[PDB]
Amino acid sequence: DLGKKLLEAARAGQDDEVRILMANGADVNAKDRFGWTPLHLAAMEGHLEIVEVLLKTGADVNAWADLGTTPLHLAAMKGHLEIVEVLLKAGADVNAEAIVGYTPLHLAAWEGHLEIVEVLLKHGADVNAQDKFGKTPFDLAIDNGNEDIAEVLQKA
Amino acid sequence: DTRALVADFVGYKLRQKGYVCGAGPGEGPAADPLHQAMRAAGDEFETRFRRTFSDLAAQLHVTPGSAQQRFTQVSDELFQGGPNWGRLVAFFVFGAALCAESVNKEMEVLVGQVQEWMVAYLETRLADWIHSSGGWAEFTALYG
C-alpha cells in the first residue's frame, strides 16, 4: 500500500518520506477515495518541495479529482503563489473547470489573492469564463468585496 | 432509511457548527455504520475544501421561492458525468452547507425543506445508481 503511504506523506509535508516512497516505486498518481492524488494534497497544503519532487518524478500536473478539481485549483484557492508558478511551468491548465464550473481564476478572485489573479491572467486565464450560475471571476471578486481584483479583471 | 441518513448528517453538521443544541436527529454519536460513514466522509471532504461549499451556498442567493431550483441545479452539476461515491459525499456536504446558509439568512423553513429535497433527489435520481453500485452497504465499506 505504498500509494496510501505516499498520499499521507504528501499531505503531511514529509519531504524525506516522499523521496523514499518514490524511490521504492510508489505510484506518483495514486488516487484516494475522493480522487485526490499526492500532488492535489501537497498543492492544497502548500508543501512546495514535495510538489516539485512529485512533478520531477512524473506526477500528472492536470490530474482531476471527483468534482474535476486540479492541483492548480487548490493552489489558487489557498493562495500558494510559488506553487501556482511551479504548476503553471509544468503545464497546469489555467482554464480547468471544477465543482460548478469554477476556473482557478474564479477561486483566486473570490479568495482575494491579487498576485495569483495576475499570474493566471498572464498565463491565459479566460477573464470572461462563467460558472454554471453565470458568474465571472469579476462578479465573485466584487461580491466578496475585493475591489483591487475586480478592477484588474475589468481592465483585462 | 434515506430520510434517516439525511436527517442524521444535516443534524450532525448543524450541531458541529454550533447552530443547534439538544434533542433530534444527529444528536450524539452515530447509531449505525452507514451514519458513521457519512459523518466521517463529509467531515474529511469538508476539511479539504474549507469554506468552498459554504461559499457556493452563499453565492446562490436563495429565496424561499428559488431555493428548490437552485438546490436542484447545484445537485445536477455535482453529478455531471455520472454519480460516484465522492460526488455523493459532495452532495451531502453541499446540502448541509445550504441548510447552514439558510440559518445565516434566517430562513428556518429551508433548513427542513432542503433536507426534504435531498431525500427526493436521492430517491428519484440516484436510486438506480446506488443500488447497482452495491447500495449503502458498499458506501459504508469504502468510506467507513
Side-chain angles (χ1 to χ4, degrees), chain A residues 1-3 5-30 32-55 57-88 90-96 98-121 123-131 133-134 136-150 152-154 156, chain B residues 1-16 18-49 52-69 71-127 129-144:
Chain A
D1 71 348
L2 271 38
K5 295 299 302 170
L6 181 59
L7 289 162
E8 298 171 359
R11 182 171 197 169
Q14 302 292 314
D15 285 11
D16 274 354
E17 182 63 7
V18 168
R19 300 203 184 92
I20 296 170
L21 288 168
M22 294 311 298
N24 272 298
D27 171 7
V28 68
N29 299 312
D32 68 14
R33 65 204 176 283
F34 305 108
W36 289 43
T37 64
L39 193 57
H40 281 91
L41 293 163
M44 181 263 289
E45 297 290 0
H47 304 306
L48 172 68
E49 178 89 324
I50 292 176
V51 168
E52 293 170 356
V53 162
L54 289 170
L55 289 168
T57 66
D60 181 347
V61 73
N62 289 315
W64 60 92
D66 281 351
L67 313 179
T69 311
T70 64
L72 181 64
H73 280 109
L74 295 163
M77 171 189 87
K78 297 297 288 166
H80 301 313
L81 171 59
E82 278 191 300
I83 290 177
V84 163
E85 292 282 2
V86 161
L87 293 171
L88 288 170
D93 185 339
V94 86
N95 297 314
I99 311 170
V100 292
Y102 290 141
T103 232
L105 182 63
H106 280 100
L107 301 182
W110 175 263
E111 297 294 343
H113 305 308
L114 174 61
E115 182 72 16
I116 286 165
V117 160
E118 291 169 340
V119 169
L120 292 172
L121 290 178
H123 290 71
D126 169 15
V127 68
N128 299 303
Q130 294 188 356
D131 69 21
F133 305 97
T136 56
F138 170 86
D139 294 332
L140 300 189
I142 277 296
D143 298 350
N144 221 17
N146 296 315
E147 254 64 46
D148 56 332
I149 287 172
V152 167
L153 288 161
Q154 174 131 348
Chain B
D1 239 29
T2 299
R3 192 169 309 284
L5 175 58
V6 171
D8 178 85
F9 183 75
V10 172
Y12 167 71
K13 298 306 288 199
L14 290 178
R15 282 164 180 76
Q16 180 186 76
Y19 287 108
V20 72
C21 183
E27 171 83 327
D32 171 324
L34 175 54
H35 296 177
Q36 188 279 341
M38 189 58 80
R39 291 189 191 189
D43 286 346
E44 173 57 31
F45 185 84
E46 210 167 5
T47 77
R48 281 170 202 220
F49 276 101
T52 299
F53 291 82
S54 290
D55 287 347
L56 175 58
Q59 287 166 17
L60 301 176
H61 305 286
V62 304
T63 65
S66 56
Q68 186 177 355
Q69 194 202 6
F71 169 81
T72 307
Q73 292 183 336
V74 174
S75 300
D76 289 342
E77 276 301 298
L78 294 172
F79 294 113
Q80 272 185 350
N84 61 45
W85 297 122
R87 296 153 177 167
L88 197 44
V89 171
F91 164 89
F92 273 72
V93 169
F94 165 68
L98 185 57
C99 291
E101 166 67 15
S102 300
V103 177
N104 297 338
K105 293 302 176 295
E106 310 201 342
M107 304 170 197
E108 296 289 350
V109 75
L110 285 188
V111 173
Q113 287 180 319
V114 168
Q115 293 174 77
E116 298 175 39
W117 303 333
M118 288 172 68
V119 179
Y121 196 95
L122 287 159
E123 291 177 344
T124 70
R125 312 289 203 99
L126 321 168
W129 185 92
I130 291 169
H131 175 65
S132 62
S133 306
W136 287 113
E138 176 67 358
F139 171 80
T140 300
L142 305 168
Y143 295 74

